[PDB]
Design a protein around this ligand. Structure first.
Ligand SMILES: CCCn1cnc2c1c(=O)n(CCCCC(C)=O)c(=O)n2C
Ligand SMILES: CCCn1cnc2c1c(=O)n(CCCCC(C)=O)c(=O)n2C
Length: 575
């Protein structure tokens, strides 16, 4: 027989192969950092210094022949292509007429962006997240933010994945006009400019490649030379742990919606949709796309953008065209892809899209039932309430009344039910609607007792400015505080108030607040009670389920209540 091949491990990249090439120690344009191959190029060097070398080699993976070629003297390079990621026991055999001899087996890794080479992620979840047996039909969604791995120190292995059906990954930008990003300050706009160098306008990119795929996370077993790292490698490993989980990239959001206003021109939609198809071929752990245009018709971060006539038809066409594209991927891969969107629920947002048309293309609508009131002005109110609060004036709820100055309300008040009923009334199916819950509060200072028109209700007072605090308190920007910060700094473990705060609840609205009457600090948020109320509202209307913004800000209480309030329920999945 020929002499047995001896594999040159260091001449063969230590048998580490990847279908994706990712730049690691630089930051450049997306097309120069990320290169995907449908087939991995495998090259394995071996030698046969003694004896006879033979004529032909065969490569085996787990005892199955995967490649063959010619032997070239005493040193040979086996070169072949292979599509399926994984870890395999490789042998190389040399053959002639006399017989065959084979190497010892050695593990080869073929990395792919489905995580097929990875073991299930090891989790590190706060034990306050409890276990439930919610029916698998109901949506239990959350948004994980790319930048949460910095000061917020919240990583993929912290997510209570057994309590989630859908993870929406916030946020993938679109190259093009993005002045709104400058409102974040810091490096955000300039990082986008770098990502978009060499990229056509209206194509998607990764905003922060360090967070997405370069940073080594030791809890994930990464080392510097691992070929895929960051959040994305952790999501791939999470998908091996929980294969029925859906992970969906979120395009847009408040600061990254400016390019959508150019989708009135179909050419720009075509460019965008093609780029999304490429993205989903590159990053196989993703299961669809979520479009978070804030908002058709305007009213978002860009005060100079919005077209009430033309943006709705553009939105619908986008959905049409995305669903054509996703059907191409389902034909090509055999998988199921979802198309979703998060939408505004003020009457003035909903009136600018004919959702009876759009929703036929969509799996789910994540209704943004939060941010109804907040620190952008000095008017208290319930930011995430189901129904109209006591503080509202006569005819404010339904919009038929007049304000304190005698000026007509322009439409129904900002509540979750007013928006859900406008969507239902034009024919959006309940079982495609997902109701939002807030894992944060918004708040004010200066709401002292002398400003209240009803002494029992701080929502009738007036503010002097935003809530101020530190990042240790969960105050990452003025006027906004993580729920886990409200629980540590204002509620306490027994939920009866600490630090000078008192707890109250508007039973009509289904909305909690905490108020420090000495500082006039007032915070509107979702709590156990209001989230139970949202779950029972969702059961009563036959909504698809609940989702939450944003998962790093919870301590377990909000997601627990989401499942609590859904107990016993099932829903028809969209088909
Ligand atoms: C409201 C919280 C602030 N905020 C809201 N949206 C945000 C941010 C933010 O801070 N960054 C930082 C990106 C820098 C990327 C890189 C390559 O370094 C963002 O990208 N986005 C979308
Ligand atoms: C994340 C951005 C917060 N943020 C910062 N400034 C804001 C917002 C906000 O959310 N809304 C509400 C949007 C429309 C809500 C509705 C139709 O129900 C605002 O009006 N302004 C000025």
């Amino acid at each position: 027989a020929p002499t047995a091949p001896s594999i040159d491990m260091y001449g063969s990249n230590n048998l580490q192969f990847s279908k994706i090439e990712l730049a690691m120690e630089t930051t450049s344009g997306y097309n120069d950092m990320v290169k995907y191959h449908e087939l991995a190029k495998i090259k394995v060097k071996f030698n046969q210094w003694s004896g006879t070398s033979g004529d032909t080699y065969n490569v085996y993976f787990d005892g199955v022949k995967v490649a063959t070629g010619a032997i070239t003297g005493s040193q040979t390079t086996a070169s072949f292509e292979y599509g399926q990621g994984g870890l395999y026991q490789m042998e190389i055999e040399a053959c002639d007429a006399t017989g065959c001899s084979k190497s010892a087996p050695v593990e080869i890794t073929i990395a792919d962006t489905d995580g097929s080479h990875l073991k299930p992620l090891t989790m590190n979840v706060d034990p306050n997240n409890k276990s439930y047996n919610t029916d698998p039909s109901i949506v239990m969604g959350t948004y994980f933010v790319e930048w949460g791995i910095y000061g917020r120190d919240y990583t993929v292995d912290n997510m209570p994945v057994d309590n989630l059906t859908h993870i929406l990954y916030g946020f993938i930008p679109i190259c093009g006009p993005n002045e709104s990003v400058k409102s974040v300050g810091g490096n955000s706009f300039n990082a986008l400019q770098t990502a978009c160098r060499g990229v056509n306008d209206y194509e998607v990119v990764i905003h922060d490649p360090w967070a997405a795929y370069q940073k080594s996370f030791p809890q994930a077993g990464h080392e510097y030379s691992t070929p895929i790292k960051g959040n994305y490698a952790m999501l791939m490993a999470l998908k091996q742990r929980n294969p029925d989980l859906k992970i969906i990239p979120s395009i847009g959001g408040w600061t990254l919606s400016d390019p959508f206003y150019d989708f009135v021109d179909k050419k720009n939609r075509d460019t965008f949709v093609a780029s999304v198809k490429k993205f989903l071929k590159t990053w196989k752990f993703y299961d669809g796309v979520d479009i978070d245009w804030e908002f058709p018709g305007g009213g978002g971060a860009a005060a100079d953008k919005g077209d009430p006539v033309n943006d709705g038809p553009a939105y619908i066409a986008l959905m049409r065209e995305l669903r054509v594209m996703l059907d191409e991927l389902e034909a090509e891969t055999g998988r199921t892809y979802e198309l979703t969107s998060a939408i505004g629920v003020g009457y003035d947002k909903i009136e600018d899209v004919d959702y009876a048309d759009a929703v036929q293309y969509m799996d789910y609508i994540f209704a943004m039932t939060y941010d109804f009131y907040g620190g952008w002005n000095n008017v208290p109110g319930h930011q995430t309430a189901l129904y109209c609060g006591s503080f509202m004036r006569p005819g404010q709820c339904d919009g038929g009344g007049v304000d304190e100055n005698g000026e007509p309300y322009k439409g129904p008040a900002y509540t979750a039910d007013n928006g859900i009923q406008l969507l239902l009334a034009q024919g959006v199916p309940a079982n495609k609607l997902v109701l939002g819950t807030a894992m944060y509060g918004r708040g004010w200072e200066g709401v002292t007792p002398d400003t209240l028109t009803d002494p029992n209700d701080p929502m009738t007072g007036t503010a002097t400015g935003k809530l101020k605090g530190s990042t240790a308190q969960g105050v990452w920007e003025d006027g906004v505080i993580d729920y886990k910060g409200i629980k540590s700094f204002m509620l306490g473990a027994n939920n009866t108030g600490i630090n000078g705060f008192e707890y109250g609840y508007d039973a009509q609205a289904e909305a909690p607040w905490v108020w420090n009457r000495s500082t006039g600090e007032l915070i509107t948020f979702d709590d156990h009670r209001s989230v139970l109320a949202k779950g029972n509202y969702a059961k009563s209307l036959g909504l698809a389920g609940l989702f939450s913004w944003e998962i790093d800000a919870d301590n377990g209480d909000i997601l627990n209540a989401m499942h609590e309030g859904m107990a016993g329920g099932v829903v028809t999945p969209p088909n």
